[PDB]
């Protein structure tokens, strides 16, 4: 599915992301916009043989297991296929582990480059 902006904001808030580990809700909404264009089925292959999966483009080298990525660590203990559900639960649960690992939201390249330093609360304004 393709979420609307406020639709995703509300779902992410229900799933506990607002202010999680220091990151206000707008950060997460902006990240999803630029990572997946709000599409729960987005996938992108990388040079290292990994793939990024779902609404938050979770990577198959470190975080989820897709069975085809060399050096897999599966630190979220989740099959990547679950991260292509239209229900965001598994992606949120893994994102919480990622953002707790010690480098904040820097794991998300699109957030680092296109969200960080901007007024991210604009992404939840009007909702
Ligand atoms: Cl604005």
Coordinates of C-alpha atoms and ligand atoms in Angstrom, one line a residue:
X1 CA 0.0 0.0 0.0
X2 CA 0.9 3.6 -0.4
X3 CA 0.3 5.6 2.8
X4 CA -0.8 9.2 2.9
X5 CA 1.3 11.5 5.0
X6 CA -1.0 12.0 7.9
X7 CA -2.2 8.4 7.6
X8 CA 1.3 7.1 8.2
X9 CA 2.0 9.7 10.9
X10 CA -1.0 8.4 12.8
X11 CA 0.0 4.7 12.4
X12 CA 3.6 5.4 13.4
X13 CA 2.3 7.3 16.5
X14 CA 0.1 4.3 17.4
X15 CA 3.2 2.1 17.1
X16 CA 5.2 4.2 19.5
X17 CA 7.6 6.1 17.2
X18 CA 6.9 9.7 18.3
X19 CA 10.0 10.8 20.2
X20 CA 11.3 7.3 20.3
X21 CA 15.0 7.3 21.3
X22 CA 15.0 11.1 20.9
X23 CA 13.4 11.3 17.4
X24 CA 10.1 13.2 17.0
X25 CA 7.4 11.8 14.8
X26 CA 8.2 14.1 11.9
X27 CA 11.6 12.5 11.5
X28 CA 10.0 9.1 10.9
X29 CA 7.5 10.4 8.4
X30 CA 10.1 12.3 6.5
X31 CA 12.3 9.3 6.5
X32 CA 9.5 7.1 5.0
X33 CA 8.7 9.7 2.4
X34 CA 12.3 9.8 1.1
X35 CA 13.2 6.2 1.7
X36 CA 10.1 4.5 0.1
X37 CA 7.7 7.3 -1.1
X38 CA 5.3 5.8 1.5
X39 CA 5.1 2.5 -0.3
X40 CA 5.2 -0.6 1.9
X41 CA 6.5 -2.7 -1.0
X42 CA 9.5 -0.6 -2.1
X43 CA 12.7 -2.6 -2.6
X44 CA 16.1 -1.6 -3.8
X45 CA 19.2 -3.7 -4.5
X46 CA 22.6 -2.5 -3.4
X47 CA 26.2 -3.1 -4.7
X48 CA 27.1 -5.3 -1.7
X49 CA 24.4 -7.8 -2.6
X50 CA 22.0 -6.6 0.0
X51 CA 18.5 -5.2 -0.6
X52 CA 16.6 -2.6 1.3
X53 CA 13.0 -3.5 2.1
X54 CA 9.7 -1.8 2.8
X55 CA 8.4 1.5 4.1
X56 CA 11.7 2.2 6.0
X57 CA 14.1 0.5 3.6
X58 CA 15.5 -1.9 6.1
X59 CA 18.8 -3.5 4.9
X60 CA 19.3 -7.3 4.5
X61 CA 23.0 -7.3 5.4
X62 CA 22.7 -6.1 8.9
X63 CA 19.0 -6.1 10.0
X64 CA 16.6 -8.5 8.3
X65 CA 17.3 -11.9 6.6
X66 CA 16.5 -12.3 2.9
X67 CA 18.5 -15.5 2.4
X68 CA 20.5 -14.1 -0.5
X69 CA 22.8 -11.5 1.1
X70 CA 26.4 -12.3 2.0
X71 CA 27.5 -11.4 5.5
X72 CA 24.0 -11.4 6.9
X73 CA 23.6 -10.6 10.6
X74 CA 19.8 -10.5 10.9
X75 CA 20.0 -8.2 14.0
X76 CA 16.2 -7.6 13.9
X77 CA 15.6 -11.4 13.8
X78 CA 13.0 -11.1 11.1
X79 CA 12.6 -12.3 7.5
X80 CA 12.9 -9.4 5.1
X81 CA 9.7 -10.6 3.4
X82 CA 7.7 -9.7 6.5
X83 CA 8.8 -6.1 6.0
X84 CA 6.8 -5.9 2.8
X85 CA 3.5 -6.2 4.6
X86 CA 1.0 -3.4 4.3
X87 CA 0.9 -3.5 8.2
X88 CA 3.9 -1.5 9.5
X89 CA 4.4 -3.5 12.7
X90 CA 7.4 -5.5 11.7
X91 CA 9.1 -2.6 10.1
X92 CA 8.5 -0.4 13.1
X93 CA 9.8 -3.0 15.5
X94 CA 13.0 -3.4 13.5
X95 CA 13.4 0.4 13.1
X96 CA 13.3 0.7 16.9
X97 CA 16.2 -1.8 17.1
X98 CA 18.1 0.0 14.4
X99 CA 17.8 3.5 16.0
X100 CA 18.9 2.1 19.4
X101 CA 22.1 0.6 18.0
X102 CA 24.2 3.7 18.7
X103 CA 24.1 5.9 15.5
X104 CA 20.6 7.2 15.8
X105 CA 18.7 7.7 12.5
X106 CA 21.9 7.9 10.5
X107 CA 21.2 4.3 9.4
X108 CA 18.7 5.9 7.0
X109 CA 20.6 7.5 4.2
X110 CA 17.6 9.4 2.8
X111 CA 16.9 10.8 6.3
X112 CA 20.5 11.8 6.8
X113 CA 20.6 13.6 3.5
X114 CA 17.1 15.0 3.0
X115 CA 15.5 15.3 6.4
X116 CA 18.1 16.0 9.1
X117 CA 18.5 19.7 9.7
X118 CA 15.2 20.6 8.2
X119 CA 12.0 21.5 10.1
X120 CA 10.8 17.9 10.3
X121 CA 7.7 18.8 12.3
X122 CA 6.2 20.1 9.1
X123 CA 5.7 16.4 8.2
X124 CA 3.0 16.1 10.9
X125 CA 1.5 19.5 10.6
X126 CA -2.2 19.5 9.9
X127 CA -2.6 15.9 11.0
Ligands
LIG1 CL1 7.2 24.0 6.0

